[PDB]
Design a protein around this motif. Structure first.
Motif, PDB file in Angstrom:
ATOM      1  N   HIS A  48     -41.914 -11.883  68.657  1.00  0.00           N
ATOM      2  CA  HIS A  48     -41.952 -13.280  69.039  1.00  0.00           C
ATOM      3  C   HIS A  48     -43.119 -13.601  69.956  1.00  0.00           C
ATOM      4  O   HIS A  48     -43.869 -14.528  69.691  1.00  0.00           O
ATOM      5  CB  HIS A  48     -40.631 -13.658  69.724  1.00  0.00           C
ATOM      6  CG  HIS A  48     -40.564 -15.086  70.175  1.00  0.00           C
ATOM      7  ND1 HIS A  48     -40.421 -16.139  69.301  1.00  0.00           N
ATOM      8  CD2 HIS A  48     -40.597 -15.632  71.412  1.00  0.00           C
ATOM      9  CE1 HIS A  48     -40.367 -17.270  69.977  1.00  0.00           C
ATOM     10  NE2 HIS A  48     -40.468 -16.991  71.260  1.00  0.00           N
ATOM     11  N   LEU A  49     -43.259 -12.825  71.035  1.00  0.00           N
ATOM     12  CA  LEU A  49     -44.307 -13.052  72.019  1.00  0.00           C
ATOM     13  C   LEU A  49     -45.715 -12.905  71.418  1.00  0.00           C
ATOM     14  O   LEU A  49     -46.633 -13.702  71.708  1.00  0.00           O
ATOM     15  CB  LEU A  49     -44.111 -12.102  73.217  1.00  0.00           C
ATOM     16  CG  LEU A  49     -42.826 -12.298  74.067  1.00  0.00           C
ATOM     17  CD1 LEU A  49     -42.852 -11.348  75.281  1.00  0.00           C
ATOM     18  CD2 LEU A  49     -42.714 -13.708  74.603  1.00  0.00           C
ATOM     19  N   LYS A  50     -45.868 -11.906  70.554  1.00  0.00           N
ATOM     20  CA  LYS A  50     -47.154 -11.624  69.913  1.00  0.00           C
ATOM     21  C   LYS A  50     -47.497 -12.743  68.977  1.00  0.00           C
ATOM     22  O   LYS A  50     -48.681 -13.095  68.846  1.00  0.00           O
ATOM     23  CB  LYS A  50     -47.096 -10.296  69.161  1.00  0.00           C
ATOM     24  CG  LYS A  50     -48.342  -9.940  68.415  1.00  0.00           C
ATOM     25  CD  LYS A  50     -49.610  -9.932  69.281  1.00  0.00           C
ATOM     26  CE  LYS A  50     -50.873  -9.628  68.405  1.00  0.00           C
ATOM     27  NZ  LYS A  50     -52.176  -9.597  69.182  1.00  0.00           N
ATOM     28  N   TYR A  51     -46.485 -13.339  68.344  1.00  0.00           N
ATOM     29  CA  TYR A  51     -46.767 -14.447  67.448  1.00  0.00           C
ATOM     30  C   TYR A  51     -47.254 -15.673  68.274  1.00  0.00           C
ATOM     31  O   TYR A  51     -48.218 -16.351  67.904  1.00  0.00           O
ATOM     32  CB  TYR A  51     -45.525 -14.788  66.629  1.00  0.00           C
ATOM     33  CG  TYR A  51     -45.565 -16.168  66.002  1.00  0.00           C
ATOM     34  CD1 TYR A  51     -46.234 -16.391  64.800  1.00  0.00           C
ATOM     35  CD2 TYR A  51     -45.033 -17.273  66.677  1.00  0.00           C
ATOM     36  CE1 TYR A  51     -46.392 -17.678  64.295  1.00  0.00           C
ATOM     37  CE2 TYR A  51     -45.191 -18.561  66.187  1.00  0.00           C
ATOM     38  CZ  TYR A  51     -45.882 -18.751  65.008  1.00  0.00           C
ATOM     39  OH  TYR A  51     -46.159 -20.025  64.591  1.00  0.00           O
ATOM     40  N   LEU A  52     -46.594 -15.944  69.403  1.00  0.00           N
ATOM     41  CA  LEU A  52     -46.980 -17.083  70.259  1.00  0.00           C
ATOM     42  C   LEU A  52     -48.409 -16.888  70.743  1.00  0.00           C
ATOM     43  O   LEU A  52     -49.242 -17.781  70.621  1.00  0.00           O
ATOM     44  CB  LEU A  52     -46.030 -17.192  71.465  1.00  0.00           C
ATOM     45  CG  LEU A  52     -44.610 -17.606  71.084  1.00  0.00           C
ATOM     46  CD1 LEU A  52     -43.722 -17.676  72.315  1.00  0.00           C
ATOM     47  CD2 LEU A  52     -44.685 -18.989  70.401  1.00  0.00           C
ATOM     48  N   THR A  53     -48.673 -15.709  71.293  1.00  0.00           N
ATOM     49  CA  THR A  53     -49.986 -15.315  71.810  1.00  0.00           C
ATOM     50  C   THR A  53     -51.136 -15.587  70.836  1.00  0.00           C
ATOM     51  O   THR A  53     -52.143 -16.231  71.179  1.00  0.00           O
ATOM     52  CB  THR A  53     -49.937 -13.800  72.179  1.00  0.00           C
ATOM     53  OG1 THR A  53     -49.502 -13.670  73.536  1.00  0.00           O
ATOM     54  CG2 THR A  53     -51.288 -13.133  72.014  1.00  0.00           C
ATOM     55  N   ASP A  54     -50.974 -15.086  69.614  1.00  0.00           N
ATOM     56  CA  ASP A  54     -51.955 -15.253  68.564  1.00  0.00           C
ATOM     57  C   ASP A  54     -52.161 -16.730  68.214  1.00  0.00           C
ATOM     58  O   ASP A  54     -53.249 -17.103  67.764  1.00  0.00           O
ATOM     59  CB  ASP A  54     -51.517 -14.503  67.295  1.00  0.00           C
ATOM     60  CG  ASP A  54     -51.398 -13.001  67.500  1.00  0.00           C
ATOM     61  OD1 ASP A  54     -50.866 -12.333  66.605  1.00  0.00           O
ATOM     62  OD2 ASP A  54     -51.827 -12.466  68.535  1.00  0.00           O
TER      63      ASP A  54
END
Ligand code: HEM
Ligand SMILES: CC1=CC[C@@H]2C[C@H]1C2(C)C
Ligand SMILES: [K+]
Length: 405
Positions: free
Chosen positions: A167-173
């Motif tokens: 989830h966090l990696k998707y937001l970040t990107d």
């Protein structure tokens, strides 16, 4: 497509570079931006893309603009404008003098000291992942190493469960390289929603993870607010999930295509740190910017208060005016000049963690998988953005040529 050229911007300085989809992407993201350093492109141009903004193409201007925070504020550092306006991360969105008090607090949770602690934990995970991959003779570098190695170390430092990564990696990107399913504002609000209950939970019951340290710390003597901690932790999360991850991929892609380069590192391991710098320059990958605080004449060009100017940390080191044969990788390069970790009062707080991750990666991979190539036929694709990166990197090798260590 393109924004109408503002009246104050000279027609001859226009050069419509698109930072999220440069023309030359196929030749390689660093090469696509390098197009801005071609023979007849000036030191400062205006691109009508992404709403219109200045772009400083040479390290001399890039360095100067970053040092002059009075004229080039970090207030609105992201492009496009909407994104830069919603960008309220601490401390990156503030200029000295108010920035320091917070930068110090952040330095406390990711600085050298914290990194020396993490040293063994980092080696263990690098080996762990590489040895587990060794016998297979193949891997999807980006997902099997580049992403879990750095992210897990950060999730450990931040005291956050690994299942939250997707989830966090998707937001970040979505913030660095938006695929369009989400605006910078939406990505940040979800990142702020994620943190809030975690920051309130660790303020109520203090632990020793980077998050608790931040929510419970002080700035120049006074207690940090909940909201201030949120803006700082979102930044920390942002700096931990999408920098080293992508960089590892540009470095390993290049190593898979440079047998001679690999041998040098096999033969002379003592040069790995130096190679780490050369690669940091060659495959520089960050590009953010500033906004003009007032009308200001810069290198013969009239800049208006409110104009955004992209200052590609990536371009300095690729500049031939800084390093001869810039596109050439040379681990013995005498003076490695660059701004890959930024320049000025906003110097990368995570660089010591970054170099450590990169170096252990180089040492441990080469020590166990010295020969590997890119999967036969694979057409590697880069993506350009605030932070550029690699879509996928298929790697193959013969297990008979490896060794447990
Ligand atoms: C190869 C790895 C990395 C590169 C190239 C890199 C690059 C940068 C750049 C170019 C800036 C300056 C932005 C500006 O002036 O607007 C910056 C700031 C920062 N980075 Fe790094 N970064 C990396 C890894 C990390 C990591 C792992 C962390 C922490 C988890 C991190 C934390 C930060 C922080 C907290 C700042 C803000 C400094 C401030 O605003 O004063 N970075 N980084
Ligand atoms: C390392 C970083 C953390 C947050 C954004 C991405 C860079 C930045 C441009 C300051
Ligand atoms: K802002």
């Amino acid at each position: 497509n393109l924004a109408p050229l503002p009246p104050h911007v000279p027609e001859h300085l226009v050069f419509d570079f698109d930072m999220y989809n440069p023309s030359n992407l196929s030749a390689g993201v660093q090469e696509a931006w390098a197009v801005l350093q071609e023979s007849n492109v000036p030191d400062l141009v205006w691109t009508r893309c992404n709403g219109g903004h200045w772009i400083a193409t040479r390290g001399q201007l890039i360095r100067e603009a970053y040092e002059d925070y009075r004229h080039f504020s970090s207030e609105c550092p992201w492009i496009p404008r909407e994104a830069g306006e919603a960008f309220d991360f601490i401390p990156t969105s503030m200029d000295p003098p108010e920035q320091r008090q917070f930068r110090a607090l952040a330095n406390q949770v990711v600085g050298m000291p914290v990194v020396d602690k993490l040293e063994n934990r980092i080696q263990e995970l690098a080996c762990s992942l590489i040895e587990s991959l060794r016998p297979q003779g193949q891997c999807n570098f980006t997902e099997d190493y580049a992403e879990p190695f750095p992210i897990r170390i950060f999730m450990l430092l931040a005291g956050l469960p690994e299942e939250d990564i997707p989830h966090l990696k998707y937001l970040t990107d979505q913030m660095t390289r938006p695929d369009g399913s989400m605006t910078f504002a939406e990505a940040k609000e979800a990142l702020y929603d994620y943190l809030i209950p975690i920051i309130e939970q660790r303020r109520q019951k203090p632990g020793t993870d980077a998050i608790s340290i931040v929510a419970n710390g002080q700035v120049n003597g006074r207690p940090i607010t909940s909201d201030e901690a949120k803006r700082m932790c979102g930044l920390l999360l942002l700096g931990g999930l999408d920098t080293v991850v992508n960089f590892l991929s540009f470095s390993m892609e290049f190593l898979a295509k440079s047998p001679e380069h690999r041998q040098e590192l096999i033969e002379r391991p003592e040069r790995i740190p130096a190679a780490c710098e050369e690669l940091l320059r060659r495959f520089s990958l960050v590009a953010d910017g500033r906004i003009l605080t007032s009308d200001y004449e810069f290198h013969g060009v009239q800049l208006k208060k409110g104009d955004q100017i992209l200052l590609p940390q990536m371009l300095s080191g690729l500049d031939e005016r800084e390093n001869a044969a810039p596109m050439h990788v040379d681990f013995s390069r005498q003076k490695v000049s660059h701004t890959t970790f930024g320049h000025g009062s906003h110097l990368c707080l995570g660089q010591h963690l970054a170099r450590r991750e990169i170096i252990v990666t180089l040492k441990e991979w080469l020590t166990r998988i010295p020969d590997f190539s890119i999967a036969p036929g694979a057409q590697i694709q880069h993506k350009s953005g605030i932070v550029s990166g690699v879509q996928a990197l298929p790697l193959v090798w013969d297990p008979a040529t490896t060794k447990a260590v």
